[PDB]
Amino acid sequence: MYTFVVRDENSSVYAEVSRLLLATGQWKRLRKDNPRFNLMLGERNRLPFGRLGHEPGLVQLVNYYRGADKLCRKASLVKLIKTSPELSESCTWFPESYVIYPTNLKTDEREVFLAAYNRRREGREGNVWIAKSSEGILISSEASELLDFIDEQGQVHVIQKYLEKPLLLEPGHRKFDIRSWVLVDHLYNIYLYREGVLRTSSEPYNSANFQDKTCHLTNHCIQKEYSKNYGRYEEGNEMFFEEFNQYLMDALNTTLENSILLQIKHIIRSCLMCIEPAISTKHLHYQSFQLFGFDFMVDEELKVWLIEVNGAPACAQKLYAELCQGIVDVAISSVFPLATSIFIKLHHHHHH
Amino acid sequence: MREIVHIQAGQCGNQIGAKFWEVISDEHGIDPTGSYHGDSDLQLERINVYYNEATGNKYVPRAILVDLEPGTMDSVRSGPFGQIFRPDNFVFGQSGAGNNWAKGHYTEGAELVDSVLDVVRKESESCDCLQGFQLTHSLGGGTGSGMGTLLISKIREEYPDRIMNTFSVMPSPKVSDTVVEPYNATLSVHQLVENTDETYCIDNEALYDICFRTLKLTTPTYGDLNHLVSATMSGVTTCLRFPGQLNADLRKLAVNMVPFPRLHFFMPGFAPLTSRQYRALTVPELTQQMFDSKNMMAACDPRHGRYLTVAAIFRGRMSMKEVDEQMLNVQNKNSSYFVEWIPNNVKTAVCDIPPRGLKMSATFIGNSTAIQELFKRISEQFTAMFRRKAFLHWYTGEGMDEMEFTEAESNMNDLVSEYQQYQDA
Amino acid sequence: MEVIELNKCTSGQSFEVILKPPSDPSLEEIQKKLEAAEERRKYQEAELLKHLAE
Amino acid sequence: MRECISIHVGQAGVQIGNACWELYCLEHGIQPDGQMPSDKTIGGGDDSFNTFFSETGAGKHVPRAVFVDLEPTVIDEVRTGTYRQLFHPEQLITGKEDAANNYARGHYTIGKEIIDLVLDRIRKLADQCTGLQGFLVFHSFGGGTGSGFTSLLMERLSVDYGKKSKLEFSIYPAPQVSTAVVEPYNSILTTHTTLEHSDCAFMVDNEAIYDICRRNLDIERPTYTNLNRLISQIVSSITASLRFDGALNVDLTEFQTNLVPYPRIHFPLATYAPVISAEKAYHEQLSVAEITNACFEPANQMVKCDPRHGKYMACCLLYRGDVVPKDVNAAIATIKTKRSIQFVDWCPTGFKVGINYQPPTVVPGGDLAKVQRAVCMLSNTTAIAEAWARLDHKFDLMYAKRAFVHWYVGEGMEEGEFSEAREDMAALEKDYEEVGVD
């Protein structure tokens, strides 16, 4: 009889994980502050990793990787991609981005951003950028509008090249992003969930008006909010992989695997193998696993771009049951055994 | 922190006290002569905690024998080890106490107490570092309860910075001598809450039940009960009498077991339960049994409360890695029953020498809030009589006012409230 | 990565390697503390002895 | 040459002193009776070993050590032990009754009666010093003597020898071997009273030494003897530079200036490799690269914690055995590319290296194999603050219900010292967080 504790009660995913854990009949739940646990479903912020792995006779395991915020907060993602040889500035699946702090906070990249913005003015290339913080979005061709915006807020933001010719599904002439769910276990096996989701927009994309949000921003909430035709083509503004595969076959004469998924597996593995030495718990006194949500854009050439990594993602509601079961299969009972996998293991050893 | 002064008072006090000296004298290799004839020197290394050394290399128990009646103490002198006790340490009146707390604390007992304290002072004046006193007594008679608690406050007055430890047998209707026992016990618990650091609550209800259900004895004698009591007493004093990785004394025991001063009433446990057995017991079996309510010497269900602190001692040769593993398993598997606000409240010790008659054994000292169940039982029996002032005349005839009774009942009910306080904290 | 202040001798050697550059109370206050705590002890002992006298 | 006095307080301190001085004598070829054939200056000395030993006209080499326990049983086994002859009886000091695992009993109640005697014996040792550097103080956080009497000793030492340096070797409390439920109380209490009196302290967590003993020595249930022989190897590599010819950490002041930029953050993490079973039938000796690399696995640290998620302020590598600078720099080069080693911005990224050419000495019949080379890394990393967080949590859990505090108040302490000490620790945790996180 293994034991466990729940310290994030706003987790959809780990709420269901709690339930099936009990339904085993071999897992008992303890109280938030009881130290004699095998398994921690920790809180999102200031999780006490320093207290883990000091209980004699308890193999302890937690559902987060200390350090993994380097990947899951946009300013740190930018910093990590351009400072690490494994990725580098020349990294071809990340939009050029620069980190910018507000006026009265003042390191920062403001001047080097406009260094490129001007050869973008001059270049006669698309010079439209998006500004982001880790609500609070601005898309503009004018840099100074960007930084005006940035510094009337108090947070550090990131300016990133907006992808001006995205892939647009038809009918609709509309945008989307792809969200992929990745589980990393205590062994640093990297597991991609076979099911992803396209978060579509219900609005025809329009290049001219960059300040009406809904045809440009794909996330579930804004479509359920400011959009006239939410739910029109697909249920929940959510197209799954069977459909998107068929659509690519029918309209573009490709498959999802060849056109997009090789690139997604490549990006997921490069990102995680990069930070692996900083976060691995291979010889630690406690163990981590973690569920990540990777978000990608696909341009009209069918090139995949990574937009962000999410450290505490929710699932699409039809997949909750399946994914969560897998989390217990692969992350939890691998460590604590009970009395066709839904995951693609991501590994590649090219010799050179 | 070396010498302990042992005092046994009354019928029950002296009969369990004598069985105690028999048992540990055997464990330490001293015979009735007082002469050491053992084979290991673990036996003699700390034998000064309980024994003085006499001329001829004799060992004399640091033990004082007290009664208001001469009967039981002449039977002590008659018994197996009777002549190991220093004869000047027999201190006795002739009246008896009639199972009457007042006679023991206020009238007959006053008359005798100064003599006992003279012998006590004589024994403590020869001690390099006296740690304190252990008293054996029952709470339901008159000498043990009444006079023993009188002794306890006199000793606290003369030795206010020494440790007072008692083994206190609680009365049960299942084994009872008289109807006034809940009165005597409640008056005594009022004393014990104020004036001892550590009390082992030896419940005659639990001893009767173990004798009847588990040992399958259909009419238990005091001899059968006292067998269990001397097993428990040998266990709980192991880490005081022997050297180990953990060498304990009365004060460190108080420090680590008692988080709040009044909550110092311990529930002892023993495994394997034995009666006057060839299969050796496996460490997992010792650990399961010692924590089982059927091995508690205080008739309380430990699942009705929470363990404040726990101290276990395993006796015999066995794997201390297995004992560590097993103790850790029972904590981590029933962690709800251990308070979360005292970290690492279970401490475990091992000693290589087992009790006579066993290759392996385990003793358990629990400071549980489930002990309240005992004090409520007594409290109920008390009120059932006191609400009609029944039998009070035996006491008012010796000077006591009803007020003293209602005060003592109140203090015990407070003790119970304290325990419930910490059972939901 | 540069090595500096290297010192050798029959029994050993020491040096420094750089990878990258940078980017009390008195005796009598103590005796007052100890004496205040002793006083508090003696007062508690007296409260006890007074209750026992009662 | 400038002398240091070692002071061992309470059970943990005394038994570890035993371990260390056995080791020192083995290393300097001093016999149990106190003789040193090797020393050709009979009756006198200006050498590096004379930092830790004085000489007599009969050629006896005597530790500059004071043992102090509030109860006799443990120092008694020094008096009757194999090194009976080594120690002058005035250097072994016992009380009658111990502090009963009670900080306030050891500090206030029983400390008061023995502090002047102990300072007098310490001055008897200091009078024999032409140029005293200061003190190495060995004690447990968890003991009542260990915590309470040591903190009173530390205040008085600052008063009588204010120009001297005081270094600590502190045993941090681990429930697998601890003896008492109040050890968190004691450790916070003593840290708070000792902080501004210690220049540099090496914390040893009994949990880490215990697991090293299980995992790498194949000892099922480690004793204090196992733990102390390993801890004494570590202490010996930390002190070797005071006892031997060299140019790194040659006096106590150098420990502070090399390892402690900020005076409050003075708790360097020690990592030690390699630890190999003497009963290991076949063992392939490990290289400079392999053991320097072992310096960066938490499983080798004296305190389990994860320096990947902290910042460094200083790093020292003490090698013993067949080691040359070229191999050290090669190993450092390769390790830097494979590992997260981030120094604070206002400190150079770099290592101070010291090498002594005789390999570690191991007690005959001990558990440790002889090895051709070994290293002890001392790194002032903010990651060590994890241990404080652990302690502080445990303390917060008990003190919330005021559990056990009555035992301290009854010794004359005031409940307020508990929350003063806890607030100092809160400060300390915040200082580490400022230096080491963004």
Ligand SMILES: Nc1nc2c(ncn2[C@@H]2O[C@H](COP(=O)(O)OP(=O)(O)OP(=O)(O)O)[C@@H](O)[C@H]2O)c(=O)[nH]1
């Ligand atoms: N590593 C190691 N830890 C020890 C040793 N002795 C005791 N400890 C630990 O120290 C704590 C107990 O403190 P002690 O040093 O024994 O206590 P003390 O200073 O003698 O104080 P009192 O005996 O209470 O007066 C526990 O955490 C022990 O596990 C030892 O020899 N080596």
Ligand SMILES: Nc1ncnc2c1ncn2[C@@H]1O[C@H](COP(=O)(O)OP(=O)(O)CP(=O)(O)O)[C@@H](O)[C@H]1O
């Ligand atoms: N360089 C870029 N080019 C084009 N569109 C972009 C873009 N960066 C972001 N977007 C769009 O903004 C939308 C949301 O941006 P982002 O993913 O950074 O915020 P977020 O953190 O709220 C998503 P989640 O809630 O899933 O974590 C994306 O779906 C995408 O349509």
Ligand SMILES: Nc1nc2c(ncn2[C@@H]2O[C@H](COP(=O)(O)OP(=O)(O)O)[C@@H](O)[C@H]2O)c(=O)[nH]1
């Ligand atoms: N376990 C045990 N209880 C006893 C023994 N003798 C008496 N008791 C109990 O002690 C109570 C009577 O007290 P007793 O010692 O005879 O009174 P006293 O001699 O006047 O102090 C009753 O509850 C008896 O059950 C005994 O030998 N063993």
Ligand SMILES: COc1cc([C@@H]2CC(c3ccccc3)=NN2C(N)=S)cc(OC)c1OC
């Ligand atoms: C290890 O088990 C024992 C422990 C002791 C006291 C209690 C204590 C303790 C420590 C931590 C948690 C809970 C209790 N540790 N103790 C001391 N170190 S004295 C006393 C014992 O007997 C008198 C004993 O054995 C029965």
Ligand SMILES: [Ca+2]
């Ligand atoms: Ca008379």
Ligand SMILES: [Ca+2]
């Ligand atoms: Ca010399």
Ligand SMILES: [Ca+2]
């Ligand atoms: Ca100073």
Ligand SMILES: [Mg+2]
């Ligand atoms: Mg009777």
Ligand SMILES: [Mg+2]
């Ligand atoms: Mg008189």
Ligand SMILES: [Mg+2]
């Ligand atoms: Mg001690």
